């Protein structure tokens, strides 16, 4: 179940966030903690491709080694708040699972700057959802969360101390694949 109306960043700079580059998830928190593993790896690219707002996603479970990529088309609800479809793809963009009615996530950028961000997402698969999921993002895969995004976590009335770090999982990412997928 999702329960939060996440508030987007005041003055959110959409072209800076959606610039074609990669974001690494360094820390996460699901308000339904059992919905996701305690160890995980995730990253995304976000950009405009031929006029359309897109994201490319990567998930990796560093223990089970379950791996998947996705390509998403985002529609605008308000500044900083989006509804995204997704298709499951291999790392090269070939479709494994097509865009499907009812398979979507919401995406809210609560905070962003040059190097970091805080997002909220509520994933839906049919009548199932994966809970309220917060993620601290960084442009550098190995950077510890700085005071700007940690203060943003507090300003959302969360505690950064309760987030789970991804940093000890030997996460290895394919940035070329993510940037290419934005076009698929």
Strand fraction: over 45%
Shape: globular
Taken together, the total number of domains comes to: 1
Strand arrangement in the largest pleated sheet: 1-2-3-4-5-8-9-10
**Number of beta strands:** 11
Structural class call reads mainly beta
Query: How large is the radius of gyration?
Result: 15 Å
Distance between the termini: 31 Å
Query: Would you state the CATH class?
Result: Mainly Beta
The succession of helices and strands, N to C, reads HEEEEEEEEEEHEH
Q: CATH homologous superfamily - what is it? A: Calycin beta-barrel core domain
What would the CATH topology be? Lipocalin
Characterize the biggest β-sheet: 8 strands, antiparallel, barrel
The percentage helix is 10-25%
CATH-scheme architecture: Beta Barrel
Number of helices: 3
Structural features, described:
The chain has an 8-stranded antiparallel barrel. The chain is globular and about 40 Å long. It has one domain (1-184): Calycin beta-barrel core domain (Lipocalin, Beta Barrel). The chain is mainly beta and 184 residues long. The chain has helices at 14-17, 147-155, 175-181, and strands at residues 19-30, 41-49, 52-60, 67-78, 81-85, 87-89, 95-97, 103-112, 116-125, 128-138, 164-165. The protein starts with 13 loop residues before the first helix and ends with a helix.
Keywords summarizing the entry:
184 residues; mainly beta; Lipocalin; eight-stranded antiparallel barrel
């Amino acid at each position: 179940a999702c329960t939060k109306n996440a508030i987007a960043q005041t003055g959110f700079n959409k072209d800076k966030y959606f610039n074609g580059d990669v974001w690494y998830v360094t820390d996460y928190l699901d308000l339904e903690p059992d919905d996701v593993p305690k160890r995980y790896c995730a990253a995304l690219a976000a950009g405009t491709a031929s006029g359309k707002l897109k994201e490319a996603l990567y998930h990796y479970d560093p223990k089970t080694q379950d791996t998947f990529y996705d390509v998403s088309e985002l529609q605008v609800e308000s500044l900083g708040k989006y509804t995204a479809n997704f298709k499951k793809v291999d790392k090269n963009g070939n479709v494994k699972v097509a865009v499907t009615a009812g398979n979507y996530y919401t995406f809210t950028v609560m905070y962003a700057d040059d190097s970091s961000a805080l997002i909220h997402t509520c994933l839906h698969k049919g009548n199932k959802d994966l809970g309220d999921l917060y993620a601290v993002l960084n442009r550098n895969k190995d950077a510890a969360a700085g005071d700007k995004v940690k203060s943003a976590v507090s300003a959302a009335t969360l505690e950064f101390s309760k987030f789970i770090s991804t940093k000890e999982n030997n996460c290895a990412y394919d940035n070329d694949s993510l940037k290419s997928l934005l076009t698929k």
